[PDB]
Every structure is written in C-alpha cells, then in structure tokens.
Amino acid sequence: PSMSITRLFPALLECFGIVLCGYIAGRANVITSTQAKGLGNFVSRFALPALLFKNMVVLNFSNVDWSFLYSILIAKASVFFIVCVLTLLVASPDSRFSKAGLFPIFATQSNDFALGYPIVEALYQTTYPEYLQYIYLVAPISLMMLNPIGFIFCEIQKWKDTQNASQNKIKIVGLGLLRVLQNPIVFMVFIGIAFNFILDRKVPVYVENFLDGLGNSFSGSALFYLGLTMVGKIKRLKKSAFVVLILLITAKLLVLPLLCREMVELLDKGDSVVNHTSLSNYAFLYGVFPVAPGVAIFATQFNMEVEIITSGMVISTFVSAPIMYVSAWLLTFPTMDPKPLAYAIQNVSFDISIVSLISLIWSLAILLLSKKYKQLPHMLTTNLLIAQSIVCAGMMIWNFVKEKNFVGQILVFVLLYSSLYSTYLWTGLLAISLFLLKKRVQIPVGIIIISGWGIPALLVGVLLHNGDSIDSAFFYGKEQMITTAVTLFCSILIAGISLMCMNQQLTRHVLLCLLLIIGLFANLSSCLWWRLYVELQFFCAVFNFGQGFISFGIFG
Numbered sequence: 001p002s003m004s005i006t007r008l009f010p011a012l013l014e015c016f017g018i019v020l021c022g023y024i025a026g027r028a029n030v031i032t033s034t035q036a037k038g039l040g041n042f043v044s045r046f047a048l049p050a051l052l053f054k055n056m057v058v059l060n061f062s063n064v065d066w067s068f069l070y071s072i073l074i075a076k077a078s079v080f081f082i083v084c085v086l087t088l089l090v091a092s093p094d095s096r097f098s099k100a101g102l103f104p105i106f107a108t109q110s111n112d113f114a115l116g117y118p119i120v121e122a123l124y125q126t127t128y129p130e131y132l133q134y135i136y137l138v139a140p141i142s143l144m145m146l147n148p149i150g151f152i153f154c155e156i157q158k159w160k161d162t163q164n165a166s167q168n169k170i171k172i173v174g175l176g177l178l179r180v181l182q183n184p185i186v187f188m189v190f191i192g193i194a195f196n197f198i199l200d201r202k203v204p205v206y207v208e209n210f211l212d213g214l215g216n217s218f219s220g221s222a223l224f225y226l227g228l229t230m231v232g233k234i235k236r237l238k239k240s241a242f243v244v245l246i247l248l249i250t251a252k253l254l255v256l257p258l259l260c261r262e263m264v265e266l267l268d269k270g271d272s273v274v275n276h277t278s279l280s281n282y283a284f285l286y287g288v289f290p291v292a293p294g295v296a297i298f299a300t301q302f303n304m305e306v307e308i309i310t311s312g313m314v315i316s317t318f319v320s321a322p323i324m325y326v327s328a329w330l331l332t333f334p335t336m337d338p339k340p341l342a343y344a345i346q347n348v349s350f351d352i353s354i355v356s357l358i359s360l361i362w363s364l365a366i367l368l369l370s371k372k373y374k375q376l377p378h379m380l381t382t383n384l385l386i387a388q389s390i391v392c393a394g395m396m397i398w399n400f401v402k403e404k405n406f407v408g409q410i411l412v413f414v415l416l417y418s419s420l421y422s423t424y425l426w427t428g429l430l431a432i433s434l435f436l437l438k439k440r441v442q443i444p445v446g447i448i449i450i451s452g453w454g455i456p457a458l459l460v461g462v463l464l465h466n467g468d469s470i471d472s473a474f475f476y477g478k479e480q481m482i483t484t485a486v487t488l489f490c491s492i493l494i495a496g497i498s499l500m501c502m503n504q505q506l507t508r509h510v511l512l513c514l515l516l517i518i519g520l521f522a523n524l525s526s527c528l529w530w531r532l533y534v535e536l537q538f539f540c541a542v543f544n545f546g547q548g549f550i551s552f553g554i555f556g
C-alpha cells in the first residue's frame with residue numbers, strides 16, 4: 001500500500017494530544033501567556049532553525065521531484081491569487097490591503113513543520129521516504145514566493161493608514177521582502193542549502209548531535225506551544241467575519257488540497273500509476289495542513305486583522321484534525337478490496353469513537369459539574385451528549401462483538417442503534433427548543449426528553465436481520481435503512497424548520513445544530529442512496545461516532 005494509513009491515527013493523537021496538553025496547560029495556568037513565550041522563543045529561534053538546517057544539509061537534491069514542488073507551489077500561488085483578487089474585490093477600502101495581504105497568506109501557508117511533518121512521517125516514512133523532503137522544500141519556498149506579496153499589501157495598508165505620507169514603493173517592496181528574509185524558516189533554508197553544497201550533505205559528526213538534539217525537540221515543543229497559543233484566541237466574531245473565516249478555512253482545507261491534487265495530476269507526467277497516485281494523495285494531505293501559526297504572528301506584528309487570523313488559525317488547527325484523518329482514509333479506499341474496506345470503516349469508526357467518547361465524557365462532565373444540565377437548552381444538549389456517548393460505546397463494543405455471537409449483536413445493536421436514532425432526534429429536538437426559547441413559553445421538557453429517547457427506542461422496537469454483516473448500519477437490512485431514513489428525515493425536517501423559525505449559549509447551540517444537520521444530511525443521503533457508497537458509509541460512520549467531537553468542539 002501507498003500510505004501506511006494505520007499509522008495516521010496515532011500520529012494525529014500525538015499531534016493533537018500534545019496541542020491539547022498545551023491547551024490544558026494554558027487553561028490551567030500551568031503556564032501563563034508571558035511564560036509561554038519562553039517556549040515560543042526556544043521553538044522558533046532554536047529548535048526550528050536547527051531542524052531546518054539539519055534537513056536542508058542532508059537533503060539529496062539529485063532525488064527531488066521538482067514536479068511535486070512546482071505542483072504544490074502553483075496550487076498555493078493559485079489559491080493566493082484567487083483569495084487575493086477576491087479579497088481586493090470584496091473587502092471595503094479601509095482594510096482591503098491588510099485583508100489582501102493576510103487572507104492569502106492564511107489560505108496557503110501550512111502548519112508544515114509542527115503538524116505536517118509528524119503526519120507525513122507516519123504515513124510515508126516507510127513507504128515513500130522522499131515525501132518527507134518535500135515538507136522542507138514546499139514550506140520555505142512557499143514563504144519566500146507568496147509571503148512577500150502579502151506583506152507588500154500589509155505595508156501598503158500601513159503606508160495608507162499613515163495618511164500624511166507620500167513615501168516610495170521601493171520601501172514598501174523592500175520592507176515586505178525583508179520580513180520574509182528575517183524569518184528563520186527562510187534564512188536557515190538558504191544557510192542550510194549553502195551547507196548542503198559545502199559539506200556534500202554530510203552534517204559534521206561533531207555538530208550532528210547538537211542539531212539532532214535541538215531539531216528533535218522541535219515537534220513536541222512546537223505542538224505544545226501551539227496548544228498554549230490556542231488558549232483564549234477564538235473571540236466572538238461578527239457574522240461577516242465568521243462567514244469570511246469559514247471561506248478562508250475552506251480555502252486552506254478544501255480548495256487548496258483539491259488544487260494540489262489536481263496540479264500533481266497535471267504536472268507529474270511520470271509513468272508509474274502507483275507513484276502518481278501516492279503523490280497525488282500526498283498533495284491532498286499536504287494541502288489539508290492547518291494554517292501556520294506564523295500567520296497570526298505576522299498579523300500581530302502588523303496589528304492587522306488579528307482576530308480573524310488568530311481565531312481562524314486556531315479553528316483551522318482543530319478542524320484539520322478530523323479533515324486530515326477523514327481525507328487520508330478516503331484517499332486510501334480505492335486501493336482496498338471490499339472486505340478490507342469494510343474492516344477499514346470499522347477501524348475508522350473505532351478510532352473516531354475513542355476520541356469522541358473522551359470528548360463526550362469531558363463535555364458531559366462540564367455540563368453536569370457546571371450544573372448547566374439544569375438549564376435550557378443545555379439539558380437537551382446534555383441528553384444528546386449522553387446519547388452520543390452510548391453510540392461511541394456501541395462502536396467499541398461492536399468492534400469486538402461484530403461477528404462473535406448472535407444475541408449479543410442484537411443487544412449491542414439495540415442499545416447502539418437506539419442511541420443513534422436518539423442522536424438524530426435530539427438534533428431536531430434541540431433546534432426545536434432553540435425556536436421555542438427564541439419565541440419567549442412553558443417548554444415541555446419532560447415530553448421532549450422522553451420522546452428524544454423513547455421514540456428512538458420505539459423505532460428500534462418496530463425494527464426488531466443480517467447476522468454476518470461487518471457493518472452495524474446493515475445488521476437489520478433494508479428495513480433498518482428505512483427506519484434510519486425516516487428518523488433522519490424527521491430530524492432534518494424538524495431541525496431545519498425549527499432553525500428557520502428561530503431565525504425569524506443559544507448562538508453556539510445553533511452552530512451545533514447547523515453542523516449536526518449537515519451530518520444528518522450525509523446519513524440521510526446515504527440512506528436515500530440505498531465507491532461513492534463506501535465514501536458516504538465513511539461520512540456516515542464518521543458522523544455517527546464523531547458527532548460527539550463536534551459537540552465537544554462547541555462545548556469545551
């Protein structure tokens with residue numbers, strides 16, 4: 001196989017676990033924001049330049065696939081151009097140039113060294129080791145090609161804000177270009193290239209241990225500092241800022257990886273289908289890396305668009321975790337026969353149910369201990385999150401019970417499927433409560449709760465076979481798909497109608513409902529449908545078990 005895809009979930013757990021460590025440490029004030037800069041300086045001024053220098057000196061340029069680099073770089077330049085032109089057209093005069101600077105940098109600059117490299121290493125270290133080189137070429141060449149342009153627009157803004165000025169364009173260009181040169185990523189690549197040539201790629205035996213020690217310390221240290229910097233960074237954005245942020249995160253995490261993939265398929269005219277495919281897949285995963293923390297640092301250095309950029313970088317980081325897991329598996333499925341693919345979807349489900357369960361336990365613990373479970377709409381959220389926890393238990397039980405008895409499968413299917421219908425129902429009932437709350441009303445909490453669990457249990461009672469199935473979604477056949485479908489059509493209608501009525505704390509609950517409704521749509525589409533089917537089986541499994549992670553992201 002082209003990707004060791006089984007190595008990705010541990011690598012994401014490493015990455016986002018160490019980010020979560022840093023986030024917990026900042027939240028708990030184990031480290032204050034001023035103490036965090038001590039780690040940030042080590043990370044950025046010592047560990048990163050050592051890592052860059054080391055890898056640059058070792059790098060065999062007579063084995064670089066320049067067509068991959070040109071592809072990713074043209075893809076980034078395209079997204080930069082698109083976001084820049086589109087920003088200049090859409091943004092208002094008073095900050096169009098800061099936006100046209102920072103939004104294209106945001107949309108293109110990846111978290112390549114801290115998050116990209118551990119993930120690439122996990123996937124490709126054994127199967128395609130030269131792909132690890134391209135982190136160190138794409139990420140710096142990306143900066144020195146695209147960042148000066150964005151900085152030039154920030155210097156144009158700074159010039160224009162200094163309204164009395166009439167100063168020269170060459171100052172703007174040189175000053176933007178100099179900020180690129182001053183970046184450790186850029187200058188240690190020039191230096192590392194110089195010592196690649198001087199040293200015939202041999203790092204000196206007596207300097208190698210130092211460069212190992214500093215460079216190897218980078219990854220965890222950077223991920224932890226990324227966690228610390230993520231604390232307190234998502235501010236309540238305006239509607240327009242939130243839509244813009246969604247668009248820019250879509251640029252970074254959807255448009256850019258699609259263009260990376262397309263460009264590799266244009267420009268890699270090499271012969272081997274397997275090499276072409278794995279490189280194409282790597283192009284997509286490369287595009288999926290979150291925004292680099294450096295962009296937020298630039299925004300702070302310019303004092304421009306800082307809330308959008310900082311929030312978006314944080315949100316991009318959190319959103320990249322599932323997108324990257326989901327994408328990498330999705331891109332692996334074409335290479336898998338249908339039974340290895342069935343077990344792959346259960347492995348995905350198990351992996352997702354682990355994180356979701358942990359996130360749900362935390363979310364429930366917060367809602368219970370804060371006693372927010374006594375309030376509305378939070379009590380309905382609490383019931384939804386209980387149902388989501390029982391779904392995640394259902395998956396981990398199903399993983400081990402999947403073909404191992406018969407009546408056990410019925411009890412494992414019974415509780416798990418009833419909870420899955422409940423998650424769907426509570427998604428609608430939650431939106432209903434938001435409408436009723438926004439209306440003023442004596443809200444019928446007891447009826448809402450007992451329906452949100454009893455209607456699911458009655459739906460499964462009505463359903464109560466396919467005993468040999470690996471996938472629980474078909475364990476009671478087409479009649480299960482019908483019962484699931486009607487449940488989803490109920491919940492989608494109920495939720496969409498009640499959110500529409502609501503449109504005539506509570507805002508976060510609307511965001512949860514929107515995101516879950518998009519998920520219910522996937523599982524309804526997949527039920528209405530019954531390679532694209534295995535892909536939406538993945539999106540259904542992903543949602544069915546992973547919905548608790550969305551709940552956590554919005555309440556945590």
Ligand SMILES: O=C(O)Cc1c[nH]c2ccccc12
Pocket residue numbers: 043044048110111112113114115222223225226291292293294
């Ligand atoms: O985006 C990257 O991978 C580079 C980077 C530079 N300074 C950082 C601090 C924390 C995490 C990553 C980085």
